[PDB]
Design a protein around this ligand. Sequence first.
Ligand SMILES: Nc1ccccc1Nc1ccc2c(c1)OCO2
Ligand SMILES: Nc1ccccc1Nc1ccc2c(c1)OCO2
Lengths: 193, 193
Amino acid sequence: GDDRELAILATAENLLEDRPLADISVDDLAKGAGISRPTFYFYFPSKEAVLLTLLDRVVNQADMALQTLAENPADTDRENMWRTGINVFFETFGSHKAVTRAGQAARATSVEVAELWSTFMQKWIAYTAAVIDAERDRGAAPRTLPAHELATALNLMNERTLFASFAGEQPSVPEARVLDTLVHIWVTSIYGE
Amino acid sequence: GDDRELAILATAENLLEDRPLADISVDDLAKGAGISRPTFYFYFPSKEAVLLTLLDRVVNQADMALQTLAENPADTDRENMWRTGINVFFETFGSHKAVTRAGQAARATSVEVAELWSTFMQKWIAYTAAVIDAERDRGAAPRTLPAHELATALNLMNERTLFASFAGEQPSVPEARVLDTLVHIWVTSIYGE
Ligand SMILES: Nc1ccccc1Nc1ccc2c(c1)OCO2
Ligand SMILES: Nc1ccccc1Nc1ccc2c(c1)OCO2
């Protein structure tokens, strides 16, 4: 049943908080989920497919929250609008730091994980660019850089900066400061002449 | 002699243009350098030490060029000053795309490579922050974000964006557009109120 599959995923996420995926065996996942190794292979072909599934759930959680925001504009200024949107990624991925860090490392080694991340980044960049274009059309932002190129760089900044903060990398922006830092750069670069 | 060592490094850089380091054997490096496998081990303990040495030369090339710029201000406006500096990284790493891509992937697997990159990033962020602080002290830039946090995010943006462009990743900014894109974001976020 789905319960055994969910047990595997819950075990994987918890074990990923203490060691990398290269330090997790299929027997570890089976044992923590209360199943045998052959039973595990009925639900997943590999431990990498387990991570892929975990990462897919996290990215779709962030995507669905962003869609929710897009359909219900909040009644605030332009700065808070961008902050509320960037915060979706801050909170969703910040609530799944182990899966986030694991998925970032797997991008090099897994074509499926690299394609998953690329597909969602393309979608989020396209939406960012559409909002910038709307702001220009209504006269609220100046026509400076091509909107899509600007949106690409800003989203890549968020990816790199958020993930450095969550991993505690050196250098990084402190996690308590990263939202204000990113919002400042987005707002000045989108609305500055 | 150094000639054999330089032959190994030249062979490694050329072979890294067609396949990753995990597809390069020590016998490949020895053969292309005109030496035997035991002779190779006299100069390097592993193929990863060869990449580490290649990456060290590239990062020191960029660092030394930036130092040169810092000691000889160019007589231009503020925008061109930032552009000339960002261009150091664009041109140095863009001239060594295979070593750059290899070194980025090795950051996950090599503590020495991760420490090398972290040390130089900290240095470049500190210098960026010092320039921002000077611009504020002279009244040319507003006192908005903490200069060091702003400098951290902007340098992480450049790292991620430049390397996506050089690797041809999807999404990325076209290489012919990435300098203008980065300069716009730096200048608006440093001087915008
Ligand atoms: N302005 C706005 C309007 C409606 C929904 C979200 C936003 N902000 C937003 C959007 C997409 C984003 C992002 C922020 O950061 C990454 O992608
Ligand atoms: N304004 C300025 C003055 C003197 C030298 C360089 C710059 N620009 C600069 C500096 C450091 C950088 C950078 C640009 O990008 C990465 O690190």
